[PDB]
Structure 1
């Protein structure tokens, strides 16, 4: 990005030394780049104008625990530390049937 000129009404500062000598020649043959002439009927501070940010609006993901869903009433939850160690689980039922 090349830095450009702009006519925005800066709070300019004054220097003790002058500038004005040999400027009229230097507009015709370029001593320096980035210059723009201004005649006295239009040499002023321009009306300041802008655009704006009005907000940065961002979603927040509220996490939903499995234990605090009401789905978990259909399950029995046990914290089991080392589950990679287990091979197989097994539950045994014994049903007696009277006559």
Structure 2
């Protein structure tokens, strides 16, 4: 009786930067995190009448 094969099953790596979900993101490199607590983004609306 004889063998006939051991078949390679490789799952390809899928990176985040190439899917166009990243068109709903603004990707910024970010050196450390746990040295930061709670960041902030500030607005200012001046409404003319």
| CA positional deviation for 1:77 | 0.4
TM-score, length basis structure 2 = 0.89
**Equivalence for 2:29:** 79
Q: Higher strand share goes to which structure?
A: 2
Number of aligned residues: 49
Report SS of the residue matched to 1:73: helix
Q: Structure 1, unaligned stretches of length 5 or more? A: 1-50
1:65-93 C-alpha deviation (Å, 9 max, x unpaired): 11111100000000101111110110000
Consecutive aligned runs of 4 or more in structure 1 exceeding 2 Å deviation = none
Q: Where does structure 2 lack aligned partners over 5 or more consecutive residues?
A: none
Report deviation, 1:58.
Answer: 2.3
Q: Which has the higher contact order (CA 8 A, sep 6+)?
A: 1
Q: CA deviation at 1:59?
A: 1.1
Within 1, Cα distance between the matches of 2:44 and 2:11? 47
Q: Over aligned residues, Cα RMSD in angstroms?
A: 0.8
